[PDB]
Amino acid sequence: GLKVPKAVQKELPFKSQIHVVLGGDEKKARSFIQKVLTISKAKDSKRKEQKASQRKERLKKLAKMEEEKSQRDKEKKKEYFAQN
Amino acid sequence: DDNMRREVQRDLLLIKHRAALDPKRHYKKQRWEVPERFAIGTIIEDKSEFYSSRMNRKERKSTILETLMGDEASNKYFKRKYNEIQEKST
Amino acid sequence: LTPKRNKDNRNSRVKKRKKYQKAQKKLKSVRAVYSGGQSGVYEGEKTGIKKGLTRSVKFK
Amino acid sequence: TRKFGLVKRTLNTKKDLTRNIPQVSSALFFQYNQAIKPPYQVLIDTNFINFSIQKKVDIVRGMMDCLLAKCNPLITDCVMAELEKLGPKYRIALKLARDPRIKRLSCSHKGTYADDCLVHRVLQHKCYIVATNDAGLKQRIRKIPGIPLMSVGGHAYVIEKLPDVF
Amino acid sequence: GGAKVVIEPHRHAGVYIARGKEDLLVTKNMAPGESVYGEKRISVEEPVPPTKVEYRVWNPFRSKLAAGIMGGLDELFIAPGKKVLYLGAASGTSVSHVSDVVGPEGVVYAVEFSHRPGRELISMAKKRPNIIPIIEDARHPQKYRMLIGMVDCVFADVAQPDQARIIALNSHMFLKDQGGVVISIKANCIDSTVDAETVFAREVQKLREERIKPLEQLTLEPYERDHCIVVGRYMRSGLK
Amino acid sequence: AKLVHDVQKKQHRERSQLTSRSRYGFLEKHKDYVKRAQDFHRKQSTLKVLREKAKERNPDEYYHAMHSRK
Amino acid sequence: AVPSVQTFGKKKSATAVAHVKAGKGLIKVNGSPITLVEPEILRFKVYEPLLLVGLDKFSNIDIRVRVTGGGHVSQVYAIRQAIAKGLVAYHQKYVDEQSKNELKKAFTSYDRTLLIADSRRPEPK
Amino acid sequence: VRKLKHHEQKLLKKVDFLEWKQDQGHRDTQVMRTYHIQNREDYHKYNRICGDIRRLANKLSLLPPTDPFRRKHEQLLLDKLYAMGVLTTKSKISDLENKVTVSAICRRRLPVIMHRLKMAETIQDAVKFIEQGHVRVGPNLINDPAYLVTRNMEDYVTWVDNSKIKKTLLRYRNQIDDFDFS
Amino acid sequence: RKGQLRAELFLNETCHSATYLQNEQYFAVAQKKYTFIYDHEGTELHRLKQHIEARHLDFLPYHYLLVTA
């Protein structure tokens, strides 16, 4: 964890300062909902990182193909200004 | 309101979390924040519909959470996935 | 000293059978193609319904 | 009782979810458009008619000889607006647009911008084949996926994006 | 067939989503304690003494308007205030849902030509008040001009190949200005020779030459083959 | 693979931590080191900006929340 | 509520806080009584604020002094500075300002290092 | 005044009751809301000074580049505007038309530098404090918010002692010494 | 006629004379030097850069002309 010294955490500006239950079916159902919640959370985190790693290769492929198309267009306007 | 929200505070959260309740569906993506006006209610069955999709008398669990608690194969899937999640997160 | 080739590419008809099969299942995602109608009894569309989305083409 | 820090009050100079993504067509394959088949409906426009006359290619027999099917040339009345507004140097194009083979549509949009009317009533339907000769309109059409378009060149029409041209 | 499902208001007023595991589309019944068609009803209890009110599941495989709804239309004109002229109302398949999405205040003039579906339609119509059964041919709106007054949306589920003349005559006679027009087009019953969106283009052009400006169309493809829901409005003054 | 073989670009398995020194197991390699070192750089950078705020405290720092905070 | 006053006192690195309030006359350093203060030879260096001016001025107040840091002689100078200026501040606020500058005259005539520490040093010659 | 109809809006376009041409976009109103200027005419008694120094820099640029009167008075004016803190660097004489602003000569006022060095938290609260008489610059107290400071006196802007906001912040940090009477 | 406060303002400098413009909705006050015009509820709307002082205002009502001397 982020550990700070006491000599610098006791001396800081104000705004930038690091500032009954049932036994049984109720609590087992609450842990059941906790189970399905962490299931859903790990699942769609997997989904979102998969999408981000997909748009990684999308960005790289698009970047190299726009690079070569931009150089082809620049040699096109180069020869167009060369045929003056 | 917050007088029956104790009874229905779970089931709307799992309906929000329908995407991983059963590993055979993949409902399409929407956030579905809890709406301001809604109402629970049960299906009633067509009188010619019989032997096919009617749930029996002693099979009618009076809550969707109890009906989901019903089948231990679904709960077995919950158990095995939560166990592999627990051992991979510890 | 060849690369790893493919039993799929060995038969010039089969790869066109086995990539038309994919192109069937690809445009299950692009549009929502007809499937055969009401298969069982109607117990819901089994995959969700959303409000703030209309997939209908407007006229300018 | 008197308030602190008062200003002479002036006027405040400043302070006085159905998304729609159009679904792809039922007629469309990946880029094939499996639901255009003879007989075709060919949208026409102004530079196409002028270029066709100055290349002396007939309209209906030219389309039949280019495409080997019965073609129904279709002129929007908004493009007949432009072909009227071109003036008296194109009266030949006018009285060849007035032709009982060339059955004409009816538009509903203010003004007479025929290129936007063409691209709109094409991408609503994807059943038409566009005849044109405009470069920018050609670029709009070959940007939108999978309609065919034709253009006069040499001394016959040529057809761009249609599979069963032979 | 006995589980519990929550309700939620849709975008269009009057129609409700029933979100459960799968999520149905549903409407609020006019005639409680009964199912006309053979659909499933979801009954809720409002808590005063407590009331028991029921909601009929709208089957999109059996009614083209419910196909268009959950295929996604940007707007209807079947609001819970309006009046609805249902051309080609065969049975209580869709007219019951259009009736109880209109509600207890407004009328659905349902027309029909054939006699056997007409008589089971009037036997349906005795049980909910707000629909008006007509047993006339739709080609002659003159012979039922006596009894429908200035409807503010028309729906057309007629399946005979003079649809444009049908909807033109009926909309000229009874549809009020700036009013709604919803068309279901069946290509195989208009003409089987040429393809589907070619006949959709023909019918859209016949609409806008009858000065019904078309705003919107939909193919409803995962439910039925080769139909199109065209929504337009009767302009009648300034088509442009 | 432009002009190279699969046996030219095959694989290079990584050696594991030894068994003699196995009490403090898991020898860490270059990707583990950069995974540790960028985190340590992040923690040192936020410590530096904290020390800078501290020595530029300006002790006339008044708000209204210093009757709930203490 | 109850009338109190908090003062400080600093030798080299030792710091002494003094809570002086109205009371019965008890003087405590970290709960220990004022008599039980080490290193036992500077107990009079601790005593001289309450000894120069007489205990009758201490009869109605009670003092609690926390000390941190420093060694022995730094702690006893911090204690005596905190005691002194706590008594002076209590008499400045709650009772006679004439008694305040009487006490200030007594302490400054004895030594002002019992009221103001000599902080800013050294000198670059 | 009535959100006029289409023909009325066509028949009179140039009407605007709210914003005329000679309001110059209401910039005096806008910047006095921005900097919470109490009195009227303070913008224009700043703008007269801004126009005055660009007039004098115009005349000094007009004077030829060799004589000591011109070069001494231009470096003198540049150092005087640095010493009043209107600038921030001793920059070129082109910044005597790009950089002198009525917003800058407002930005050296007392409540805005008070909010700048976080003494208050908003400039309205700063005018509240220095109208209640809590602050001083060096020895002498400040009662009016029109006192803009110099480059020298951005360091001794501190409250007076027995200012109970000073007492409450010291007792927040519990460094409340009370021998020094605050 | 009915007792209705519309706009009541003490502005510190001297005001020689003032008038209404076309309604109760606008009124121009001739202050110490600059003539100001004001909204119905007392906000100011224009500090006239011209009318470098004023003593007598008037309003020509059909011409919509505020005249100052």
Ligand SMILES: [Zn+2]
């Ligand atoms: Zn047009």
